[PDB]
């Protein structure tokens, strides 16, 4: 019966909670209490990218750590040479309501999407010397919140129809559909081995998905509001989520638990973007208070503040070599911090 | 100093800057209207009058003014996650069916369609992103409401109604019950029309209201207001 299955579900949730509490001998703060703090972290704006004429909604770094793509709602996706502040490309979008952008690991493609329900794949290296739309992926029935390349031929998108999808680009069809979220999936993050990906939605829960099997392996709760951002730890065994209740949280995959909460009393605004440093010691988070906060990820102390934007810090990224942090904001200026 | 290819890349970047600035100057001369309404509220009729999945963008030029209309009716997802994308629109065109004062919602019974439209208008008008964004309100199907009001009194919808069962008193009552949901009466203004079937009398009203909004934005830019 319905009621019997609901009772079984409640029993299994109690079992999961008891098994999580059983292997919770010590907290992360009880072991990291003896290591040295990182001290005051001061990063100065090195490069300001003055090319966007409207709110920037996403940015992604290239693998080479020099080029960065940035998407704004003026209809322009701009590829930037961050060393010289040059403009390598400016791509006019068919729909100007772009909410995400991705840069392929090979560097040959970029992607974007948004309120048009379509993920557009743009080829950068053509014989004609311009950037053309190589593909348009349709099939999502809500706004497309986050996209990330696996390789040249495979992409993972997360939309506002409570689903994620793994697409084969050259056919244009969803290879896999990931269902299970009951709210708008707002972000995703790929593991370094690109076999598992986590996704945070608007039901205050994150889920870990196996790309190959298309099934949800673990569900992580603990937030009290919409999860607007998520990012793996660099070894792939943990991740951090940013939410609307002014807290970041560090969850562990193998222990199936929240490890750390990053929150301060003087912080009430919501997190829109999280990222780690190269070693994972720093956790950077963009907030709606127009400022970025750098947290000691092992000690939950606010190590530093990146305060250089006049509007909400909408997007944030750290290079592969860890040399710089790029923040993009609603006041149209990307800034490179170091 | 720079090499030859570095100088040519800088020249490429400056040409890209010029094209971006020209495209921004072209895009800043266009009027963006966010189209909003309830289910089956006559949004489609409004779109057809203006012309003559995801975002449905409409383009129409009137009196050498270029209007872009963004219909977001197919977004079944939560509204508060994408509504801030439309913070810089010129105006919000809200469509309300006047013949919904007796109908009930097909999704949920015991909830009036007119009350649901009033709740949606309350959510949009007093939202924190539209603190100073004016609202053009359209009250569709006035002939249907005229026919229905004689047979069916308005007091099933609004139990505080005291006026007569005529078209004009009931229509002005519904207009007042929609206009008084504006909390920020000083910073934003509500323009109301009754969706006349006559050609170039609805898009004429949109042109007049957008001209008023442009004059008020220019006054706030010059420091006079």
């Amino acid at each position: 019966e319905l009621d019997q299955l609901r009772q079984e579900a409640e029993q299994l949730k109690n079992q999961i909670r008891d098994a999580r509490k059983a292997c919770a001998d010590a907290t992360l703060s009880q072991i990291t209490n003896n290591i040295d703090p990182v001290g005051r972290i001061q990063m100065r704006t090195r490069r300001t990218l003055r090319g966007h004429l409207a709110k920037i909604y996403a940015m992604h770094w290239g693998t080479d750590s020099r080029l960065l793509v940035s998407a704004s709602q003026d209809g322009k996706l701009i590829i930037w040479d961050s060393y010289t502040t040059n403009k390598v490309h400016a791509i006019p979008l068919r729909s100007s309501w772009v909410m995400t952008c991705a840069y392929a690991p090979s560097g040959n493609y970029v992607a974007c999407g948004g309120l048009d329900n379509i993920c557009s794949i743009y080829n950068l290296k053509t014989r004609e010397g311009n950037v053309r739309v190589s593909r348009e992926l349709a099939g999502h029935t809500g706004y497309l919140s986050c996209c990330r390349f696996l390789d040249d031929n495979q992409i993972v998108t997360s939309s506002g129809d409570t689903t994620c999808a793994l697409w084969d680009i050259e056919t244009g069809q969803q290879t896999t559909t990931f269902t299970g979220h009951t709210g708008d999936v707002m972000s995703l993050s790929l593991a370094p081995d690109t076999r598992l990906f986590v996704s945070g939605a608007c039901d205050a829960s994150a889920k870990l998905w196996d790309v190959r099997e298309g099934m949800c392996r673990q569900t992580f709760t603990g937030h009290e509001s919409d999860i607007n951002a998520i990012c793996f730890f660099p070894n792939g065994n943990a991740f951090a989520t940013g939410s609307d209740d002014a807290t970041c949280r560090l969850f562990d995959l193998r222990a199936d638990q929240e490890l750390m909460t990053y929150s301060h009393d003087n912080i009430i605004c919501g997190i829109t973007s999280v990222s780690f440093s190269k070693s994972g010691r720093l956790l950077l988070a963009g907030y709606d208070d127009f400022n970025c906060n750098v947290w000691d990820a092992l000690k939950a102390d606010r190590a530093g503040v990146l305060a250089g934007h006049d509007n909400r810090v909408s997007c944030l990224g750290v290079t592969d070599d860890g040399m710089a942090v790029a923040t993009g904001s609603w006041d149209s200026f990307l800034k490179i911090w170091n | 100093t720079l090499s030859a290819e570095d100088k040519a890349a800088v020249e490429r970047s400056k040409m890209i800057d010029r094209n971006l600035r020209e495209d921004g100057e072209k895009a800043a001369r266009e009027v963006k209207l966010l189209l909003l309404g309830a289910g089956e509220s006559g949004k489609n009729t409004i779109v057809k009058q203006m012309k003559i999945t995801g975002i449905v963008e409409t383009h129409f030029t009137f009196k050498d003014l270029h209007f872009k209309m963004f219909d977001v009716g197919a977004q079944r997802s939560e509204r508060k996650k994408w509504i801030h994308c439309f913070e810089g629109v010129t105006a919000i065109i809200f469509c309300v069916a006047l013949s919904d004062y007796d109908l009930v919602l097909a999704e949920d019974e015991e909830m009036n369609r007119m009350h649901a439209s009033m709740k949606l208008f309350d959510s949009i008008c007093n939202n924190k992103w539209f603190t100073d964004t004016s609202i053009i309100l359209f009250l569709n199907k006035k002939d249907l409401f005229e026919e229905k009001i004689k047979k069916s009194p308005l007091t099933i919808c609004y139990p505080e109604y005291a006026g007569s069962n005529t078209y004009e008193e009931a229509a002005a009552y519904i207009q007042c019950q929609f206009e008084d949901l504006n909390k920020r009466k000083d910073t934003k203004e509500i323009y109301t029309h009754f969706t006349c079937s006559t050609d170039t009398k609805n898009v004429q009203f949109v042109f007049d209201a957008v001209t008023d909004v442009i004059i008020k934005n220019n006054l706030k830019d010059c420091g006079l207001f």
């Epitope: 020099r66 014989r127 004609e128 | 090499s3 030859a4 290819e5 040519a8 890349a9 020249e11 040409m15």
Partner: single-chain antibody, 235 residues
Framework: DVQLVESGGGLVQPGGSRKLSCSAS????????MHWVRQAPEKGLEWVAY????????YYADTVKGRFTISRDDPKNTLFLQMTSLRSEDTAMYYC??????????????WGQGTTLTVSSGSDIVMTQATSSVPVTPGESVSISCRSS???????????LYWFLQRPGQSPQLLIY???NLASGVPDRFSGSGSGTAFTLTISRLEAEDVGVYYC?????????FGAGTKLELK
């Protein structure tokens, strides 16, 4: 399909004038810088002129400075070289070359077929290809050496060395751009390695297609200068 077609050549009396046209089809012409590169009938390539995308910067070789004028018309996708007071030194096969410049771009990647012009009767970087002929056998690995007078390694890490191949009867073709980067559509076997001033181009497992004249070009400073060219023959 990308094509540059040159027209306007012929026999011109000395002191005369002639206008060359290059019609471009199959690519976004207004975003490519364009070069004119002539070739004497028994001698190596020589750079003539360059106009940028958007016609901002125009450079000429010292030989043709004042006499020649390069211009472009972007809506008609056409490139003009107006030549006045032609001497007998301007007898050459002229090539229209496209080149785009951004981070990681490949300049000098496509060359037109060329038009034939027959005229009847100090601080420039010297690029040196010491050997002029290396007889090779198919299936072998050969090295082509090129020495520069001034070091081509810039302070930004890029060494602006460009290796081109001209098969017999065809236009030159880009093989290596910026010392080590293999051009698009070029086979794996070609590989460039350089040390500031001395550069080598290695062709392992040589094939019949590979025979022809190889030129090294610098791009560090204008005027762009080519080597004399090293010729690979059969047997």
């Amino acid at each position: 399909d990308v094509q540059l077609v040159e027209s306007g050549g012929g026999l011109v009396q000395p002191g005369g004038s002639r206008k060359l046209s290059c019609s471009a089809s199959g690519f976004a012409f207004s975003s490519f810088g364009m070069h004119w590169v002539r070739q004497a009938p028994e001698k190596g390539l020589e750079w003539v002129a360059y106009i940028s995308s958007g016609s901002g910067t125009i450079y000429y070789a010292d030989t043709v400075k004042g006499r020649f004028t390069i211009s472009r018309d972007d809506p008609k996708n056409t490139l003009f070289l107006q030549m006045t007071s032609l001497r007998s030194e301007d007898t050459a096969m002229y090539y229209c070359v496209r080149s785009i410049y951004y981070y990681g771009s490949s300049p000098f990647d496509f060359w037109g077929q060329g038009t034939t012009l027959t005229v009847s009767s100090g601080s420039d970087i010297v690029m040196t290809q010491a050997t002029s002929s290396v007889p090779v056998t198919p299936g072998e690995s050969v090295s082509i050496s090129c020495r520069s007078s001034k070091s081509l390694l810039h302070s930004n890490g890029n060494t602006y060395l460009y290796w081109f191949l001209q098969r017999p009867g065809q236009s030159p073709q880009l093989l290596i751009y910026r010392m080590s980067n293999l051009a698009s559509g070029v086979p794996d076997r070609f590989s460039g390695s350089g040390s500031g001033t001395a550069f080598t181009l290695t062709i392992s497992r040589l094939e019949a297609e590979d025979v022809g004249v190889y030129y090294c070009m610098q791009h560090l400073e204008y005027p762009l200068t080519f080597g004399a060219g090293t010729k690979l023959e059969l047997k």
